[PDB]
Design an enzyme around this catalytic site. Structure first.
Site, PDB file in Angstrom:
ATOM      1  N   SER A 105      24.465 -19.234  -1.524  1.00 22.45           N
ATOM      2  CA  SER A 105      23.224 -18.562  -1.203  1.00 22.45           C
ATOM      3  C   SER A 105      22.325 -18.123  -2.412  1.00 22.45           C
ATOM      4  CB  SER A 105      23.539 -17.428  -0.242  1.00 22.45           C
ATOM      5  OG  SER A 105      22.332 -17.080   0.434  1.00 22.45           O
ATOM      6  N   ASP A 187      20.970 -23.861   9.236  1.00 17.50           N
ATOM      7  CA  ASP A 187      21.181 -22.612   8.519  1.00 17.50           C
ATOM      8  C   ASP A 187      20.382 -21.455   9.220  1.00 17.50           C
ATOM      9  OD1 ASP A 187      21.379 -20.572   6.332  1.00 17.50           O
ATOM     10  OD2 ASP A 187      21.828 -22.318   5.102  1.00 17.50           O
ATOM     11  N   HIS A 224      25.302 -20.834   7.971  1.00 21.27           N
ATOM     12  CA  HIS A 224      25.163 -20.390   6.597  1.00 21.27           C
ATOM     13  C   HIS A 224      26.498 -20.205   5.898  1.00 21.27           C
ATOM     14  CE1 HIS A 224      22.845 -19.163   3.151  1.00 21.27           C
ATOM     15  NE2 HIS A 224      23.571 -18.077   3.014  1.00 21.27           N
TER      16      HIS A 224
HETATM   17  P1  LIG Z   1      22.095 -15.617   0.911  1.00 20.51           P
HETATM   18  O1  LIG Z   1      22.259 -14.758  -0.328  1.00 20.51           O
HETATM   19  C1  LIG Z   1      23.249 -15.177   2.061  1.00 20.51           C
HETATM   20  C2  LIG Z   1      23.419 -13.725   2.363  1.00 20.51           C
HETATM   21  C3  LIG Z   1      23.918 -13.554   3.773  1.00 20.51           C
HETATM   22  C4  LIG Z   1      23.634 -12.173   4.338  1.00 20.51           C
HETATM   23  C5  LIG Z   1      23.618 -12.199   5.853  1.00 20.51           C
HETATM   24  C6  LIG Z   1      22.932 -10.986   6.388  1.00 20.51           C
HETATM   25  O2  LIG Z   1      20.661 -15.500   1.434  1.00 20.51           O
HETATM   26  C7  LIG Z   1      19.447 -16.125   1.048  1.00 20.51           C
HETATM   27  C8  LIG Z   1      18.280 -15.350   1.616  1.00 20.51           C
END
Ligand SMILES: *[P@](=O)(CCCCCC)OCC
Ligand SMILES: *[C@@H]1O[C@H](CO)[C@@H](O[C@@H]2O[C@H](CO)[C@@H](O)[C@H](O)[C@H]2NC(C)=O)[C@H](O)[C@H]1NC(C)=O
Length: 317
Positions: A105, A187, A224
């Site tokens: 992420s 995602d 995700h």
């Molecule tokens: P990434 O850093 C994933 C973080 C997941 C938190 C879920 C609430 O995100 C990109 C914006």
């Protein structure tokens, strides 16, 4: 693409030193290390010990990770200093040997931002294996900001921010080191990711961009957290890490690997935990820092986002 001497760190190195950890070794004397950069709302262990800490271990690496406080919720620019510090320490710490960076992420955006604005580390990172990186940020945070319920790095990760603008304008949307980007059209966190092209937020020119469905089909759904933890991800992950070319190889993965459940090599405790990944994240976000403006960009990046507006006002070089 910027070159020259690295910008100075705004933080004391003892603080940046405080943020790094290796599993059973010191940074100064660690062998075959891999650096792991976590996502928003998490610490290195919260993001990776149910997945890539155990997985990089069995492939012969010593997992080291950074945990910028508080939970990656702070100025992405500062989170980057932790990464620059770590790489510098591990290249040194493993005998001036290059090292692979594995991110999740926001961590992929940090890896790229550091590779873009801190030229020294370009020769220390061997390859970058990035799971669901949001290099153009996310269209999904619109509410959150008009909602001004946002931690600094949430403002920075919203499509249209001064930070993502600066990254594109400085040339960081192209691979600096051999980079493999693994992602999903499905995602729930980072969007857009549906076109299997430059429009996706995870895409880097010349990188090996793997959109899940482009391999597995339109019916393949991974989320995700599953972009990082799934069995499909382990196969491409391992391919990238073993590749002579520095990027994942097609010959290595196929339809047989299109398994969305957490990796097979994980203990059940670990698989359950990997399925529950976003919980610690979502809690921290609700609980931590908020603000109504995007943090100001550091001097070194202002000329690449001139005219955009941050906490202080309009951006000027
Ligand atoms: P990434 O850093 C994933 C973080 C997941 C938190 C879920 C609430 O995100 C990109 C914006
Ligand atoms: C979070 O990042 C901010 C924003 O850059 C950091 O705040 C700065 O503190 C440094 C060094 O301690 C000073 O050089 C600057 O004058 C500060 N700028 C602003 C806008 O506050 C902060 O130190 C970081 N904190 C954590 C816990 O990561």
């Amino acid at each position: 693409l910027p070159s020259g001497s690295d910008p100075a760190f705004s933080q004391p190195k003892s603080v940046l030193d405080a943020g790094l950890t290796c599993q059973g070794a010191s940074p100064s004397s660690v062998s075959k290390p891999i650096l792991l950069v976590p996502g928003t709302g998490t610490t290195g262990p919260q993001s990776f010990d149910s997945n890539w800490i155990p997985l990089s271990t069995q492939l012969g690496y010593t997992p080291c990770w950074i945990s910028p406080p508080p939970f990656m919720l702070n100025d992405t620019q500062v989170n980057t200093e932790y990464m620059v510090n770590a790489i510098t320490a591990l290249y040194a710490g493993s005998g001036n040997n290059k090292l692979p960076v594995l991110t999740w992420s926001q961590g992929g955006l940090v890896a790229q931002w550091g590779l873009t604005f801190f030229p020294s580390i370009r020769s220390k990172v061997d390859r970058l294996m990035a799971f669901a990186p949001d290099y153009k940020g996310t269209v999904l945070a619109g509410p959150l900001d008009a909602l001004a319920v946002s931690a600094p790095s949430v403002w920075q990760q919203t499509t249209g921010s001064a930070l993502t603008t600066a990254l594109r304008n400085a040339g960081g949307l192209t691979q600096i080191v051999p980079t493999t980007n693994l992602y999903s059209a499905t995602d729930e966190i980072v969007q857009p990711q549906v076109s299997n092209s430059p429009l996706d937020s995870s895409y880097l020119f010349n990188g090996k961009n793997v959109q899940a469905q482009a391999v597995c089909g339109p019916l393949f759904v991974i989320d995700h957290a599953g972009s990082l933890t799934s069995q499909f991800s382990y196969v491409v992950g391992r391919s990238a890490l073993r590749s002579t070319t520095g990027q994942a190889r097609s010959a290595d993965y196929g339809i047989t690997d299109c398994n969305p459940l957490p990796a097979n090599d994980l203990t059940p405790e670990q698989k359950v935990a990997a399925a529950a990944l976003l919980a610690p994240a979502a809690a921290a976000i609700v609980a931590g820092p908020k603000q109504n403006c995007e943090p100001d960009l550091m001097p070194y990046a202002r000329p690449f986002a001139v005219g955009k507006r941050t906490c202080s006002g309009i951006v000027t070089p």
